[PDB]
Design a protein around this ligand. Structure first.
Ligand SMILES: [Zn+2]
Lengths: 241, 102, 219, 328
DNA sequence: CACCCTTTCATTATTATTATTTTTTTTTTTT
């Protein structure tokens, strides 16, 4: 629950790789995980070739990987965790819009880890903090750390559904980019500026980019509904073994 | 008014702050934009600035319209510092008349 | 003294991931001041706690600075900035022939490596930044006089400070509590928008090794 | 310390922007669907705050060069004009990962997080080139803050500040320059023009039927290859515009400021554009102000001789082992 | 083991985009 590397034992079952070294000397934090590698814990030296782009998101500089995020740095843990929530019971893929209606809006569990890939494959699961309580969702998307709240997103959905009530055609009140790469991400639409009031415009403008990024996947022409996820835990276990 | 400028005591209390930073940033060599309303007595504050610059050894020039001239030299007669360093006026050809023609 | 600080911007700034804390700004400013007043070979850990603020201690350890986070009032819509990174391959080829470059590889890679082209997008906000803190106004003015940028010390031109202002305000008006707090904070200090998470409460807020179990507000 | 470089662009300025931008043939930007549109890559513009008009703040577009382009242009002109001749008159051979750290802002010397002692942080921030930007696995803050190239424009009066009201532009500063590519096989005249082609008439005819079949098939699909015949558009900033460039150095040495000054002495041969084929981004320098005092002359830089002597003895003494020790 | 090639895997899916509407005065006290 404390670290992202706690998904390696509490959720899925995995062990350290053969050939990893035990930690010596004074205890230092991991280069990736931010977990303090105490003595008696297994670790790896950093022997990456010159293709690791994620130097900016290294937690520390101790040149040492904790064994749990040695496991998280292997390739099936990279591509198989491209879009998933890792709660205390299983790993659920969230690539469906209905799943992001399930997690962003009224999620059942409190503790989890939410990862989504902007690109094809990035080092993602170890650099994101664990969502502890549901009221503050921590999401990673690409090189971006994001915060989502359920109640504010529910308020936004209620506002948009009541202002879109009575219209057969769905009109987007405020545009949000799915890639979060366009300049117009977060911009109020023209008609949506009419059918929202000024306080509603300020409320939809004041949200953190995580809620904007969630409302991209959740506020659009067809509207998702919250249904639970297909468990990809056995899938990424079969990929890993 | 401890460590006051020359002629500060005849300047009103509201214009004292403008006068102090105006003298300070003209002591630094900058061109000072000092703004006050009409009835706040800008002539007395200008007199304080002119006297406080005049005791430094500076050749001080005060440019003003000819209507403002009489009250400006009225604010520049009784303070002892401009009495010591002197006050003069520069006037042109349109300040005088031809004697033969008149 | 229980005062309150606004910063208005001559340039748009990076919208901060999580909270821009005022004590982080003052710590970076004091680090820059210590770099001016000693030199370059110093420890930034030594002086980024030497702040003219109050230090709140939670009931069982876990002390934090008495400085709330920067609340944002958007003067502008939250736009986006794009930046890219790539090494110029043409000069690399001419340096490889001239002998100034020693490159065994005869091919670059835009997806990874030294010649990787990278595109990345960050939110951009032009805003009035208002924080609330208990401390000495003169020291905050002396720190913020050097504050030419805020939110990102990017060196590329963002967050340039048009100005700053500090005023004392009454006790009941000031929401100091809107800050990343420890979970053992007082019941009058925990609010509804606070939630339990992993966050830094002190010093370097980017250092994930110092991140603790904290109750913090949402920007 | 601050260096403000006021330049005029001899040629247009083009720094391409992301997003999918569409213009009609008349000039309407981003049309509603159901009408013919056109690909358009606008120059980079930010929405900035404006106190023009009323006292309340309004969001106005402002067409700039990004500061990253400025930073890389200053970096690359220091490498191309003073650093590389010094390092090849000595015989120095850089390594990839040290060349990548000097020439780009990348950490492929060691992708690992390299620990940095405070003494080595001090000894690399005092380097004449390295301490300006930093970069690499150390990820140390460079001393050089390079701002965006801002045009002297009324939308930028908050960014520009007071004092630029004289010699100031207003109104639109972007022109949508239309460019095109023709299929040059259609340009082929006769047997003398076609004899250099292997196949000649047969190959030219075969490409003409291939292009014809592809175009008629695409038009029948409208009621995945692509031909050479293109016609597109791109917004550029107007040539002859005046620009300010702010370069603020966080506690610099004399040699670092001398390196920036010798960059400005030789940056007339450099370009600032996404239009290198079209000679876009050629500029001349009209003013360089150091700490508020102008120093640029028509025959390069006249003034700051202490900076010039400092940078001369700095670039003479470098032997590129400091670049390698900066990388790893 | 430091220098590279070249293979490999991944699940959902949609698309909106700010730009303007003066009056025509005769002051002042220079060479
Ligand atoms: Zn770990």
């Amino acid at each position: 629950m404390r670290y992202p590397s706690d998904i390696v034992d509490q959720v899925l079952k995995a062990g350290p790789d053969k050939g990893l070294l035990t930690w010596e000397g004074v205890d230092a934090a991991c280069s990736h995980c931010s977990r303090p590698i105490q003595n008696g814990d297994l670790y790896s030296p950093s022997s990456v070739g010159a293709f690791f782009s994620d130097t900016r998101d290294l937690a520390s500089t101790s040149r040492s990987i904790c064994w749990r995020c040695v496991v998280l740095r292997k390739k099936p843990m990279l591509y198989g965790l491209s879009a998933a929530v890792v709660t205390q019971d299983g790993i659920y893929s969230i690539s469906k819009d209905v799943n992001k209606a399930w997690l962003f809006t009224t999620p059942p569990p409190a503790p989890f880890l939410v990862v989504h890939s902007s690109s094809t494959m990035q080092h993602l699961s170890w650099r994101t903090p664990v969502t502890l309580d549901n009221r503050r969702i921590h999401v990673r998307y690409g090189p971006n750390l994001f915060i989502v709240r359920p109640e504010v997103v529910r308020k936004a959905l209620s506002i948009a559904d009541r202002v879109n009530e009575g219209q057969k055609k769905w009109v987007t009140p405020v545009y949000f980019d799915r890639k979060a790469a366009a300049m117009g991400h977060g911009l109020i639409t023209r008609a949506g500026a009419e059918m929202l009031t000024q306080e509603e415009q300020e409320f939809f403008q004041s949200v953190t980019p995580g809620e904007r990024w969630a409302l991209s996947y959740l506020m659009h022409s067809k509207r998702p509904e919250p249904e639970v996820g297909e468990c990809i835990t056995e899938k990424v276990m079969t990929s890993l073994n | 008014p401890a460590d006051a400028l020359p002629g500060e005591g005849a300047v009103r209390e509201v214009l004292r702050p403008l006068l102090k930073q105006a003298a300070e940033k003209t002591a630094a060599g900058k061109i000072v934009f000092a703004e006050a309303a009409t009835g706040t007595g800008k002539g007395r504050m200008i007199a304080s600035l002119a006297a406080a610059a005049a005791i430094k050894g500076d050749t001080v020039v005060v440019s003003a319209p000819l209507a403002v001239t009489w009250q400006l030299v009225n604010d520049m007669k009784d303070i002892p510092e401009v009495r010591r360093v002197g006050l003069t006026l520069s006037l042109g050809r349109p300040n005088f008349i031809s004697p033969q023609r008149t | 003294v229980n005062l309150k600080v606004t910063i208005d911007l001559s340039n748009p700034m990076m919208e901060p991931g999580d909270l821009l804390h005022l004590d982080a700004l003052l710590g970076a400013l004091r680090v820059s001041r210590a770099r001016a007043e000693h030199g370059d070979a110093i420890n930034p850990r030594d002086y980024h706690y030497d702040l003219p603020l109050e230090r709140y201690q939670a009931p069982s350890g876990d002390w934090v600075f008495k400085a709330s986070a920067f609340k944002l009032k958007r003067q502008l819509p939250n736009q986006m900035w794009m930046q890219t990174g790539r090494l110029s391959i043409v000069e690399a080829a001419r340096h490889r022939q001239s002998g100034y470059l020693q490159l065994r590889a005869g091919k670059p890679n835009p997806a990874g490596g030294p010649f990787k082209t990278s595109i990345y997008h960050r939110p951009i906000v032009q805003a009035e930044l208002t924080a609330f803190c208990v401390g000495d106004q003169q020291g905050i003015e002396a720190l913020l006089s050097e504050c030419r940028q805020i939110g990102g010390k990017r060196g590329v031109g963002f967050g340039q400070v048009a100005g700053f202002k500090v005023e004392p305000v009454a006790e009941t008006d000031c929401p100091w509590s809107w800050r990343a707090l420890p979970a053992d904070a007082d019941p009058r200090l925990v609010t509804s928008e606070h939630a339990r998470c992993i966050a830094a409460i002190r010093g370097p807020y980017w250092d994930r090794t110092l991140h603790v179990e904290a109750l913090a507000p949402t920007p | 310390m601050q260096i403000e470089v006021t330049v005029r662009n001899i040629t247009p300025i083009f720094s391409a922007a992301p997003g999918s931008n569409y213009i009609t043939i008349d000039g309407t930007i981003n049309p509603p669907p159901g009408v013919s549109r056109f690909p358009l890559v606008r120059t980079r513009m930010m929405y900035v705050a404006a106190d023009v008009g009323d006292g309340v703040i309004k969001s106005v577009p402002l067409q700039i060069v990004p500061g990253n382009t400025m930073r890389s242009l200053l970096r690359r002109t220091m490498l191309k004009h003073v650093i590389e001749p010094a390092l090849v008159e000595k015989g120095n051979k850089l390594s990839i990962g040290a060349y990548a750290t000097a020439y780009s802002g990348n950490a492929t010397g060691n992708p690992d997080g390299v620990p940095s002692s405070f003494d080595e942080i001090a000894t690399m921030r005092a380097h004449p080139f390295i301490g300006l930007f930093g970069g690499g696995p150390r990820m140390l803050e460079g001393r050089l803050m390079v701002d965006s190239l801002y045009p002297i424009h009324t939308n930028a009066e908050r960014i520009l500040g007071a004092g630029y009201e004289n010699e100031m532009m207003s109104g639109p500063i972007t022109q949508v320059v239309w460019a095109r590519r023709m299929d040059p096989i259609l340009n082929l005249g006769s047997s003398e023009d076609v004899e250099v082609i292997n196949g000649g008439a047969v190959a030219a005819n075969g490409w003409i039927q291939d292009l014809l079949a592809n175009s008629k098939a695409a038009a029948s699909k409208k009621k995945n290859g692509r031909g050479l015949k293109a016609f597109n558009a791109h917004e550029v900033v107007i040539p002859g515009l005046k620009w300010v460039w702010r370069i603020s150095l966080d506690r610099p040495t004399d040699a670092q400021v001398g390196l920036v000054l010798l960059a400005l002495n030789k940056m007339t041969n450099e370009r600032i554009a996404g239009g290198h084929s079209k000679d876009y981004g050629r500029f001349v320098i009209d003013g360089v102000s150091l700490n508020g005092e102008q120093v640029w002359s028509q025959s390069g830089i006249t003034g700051g001789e202490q900076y010039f002597d400092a940078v001369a003895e700095a670039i003479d003494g470098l032997s590129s082992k400091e670049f390698e020790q900066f990388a790893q």
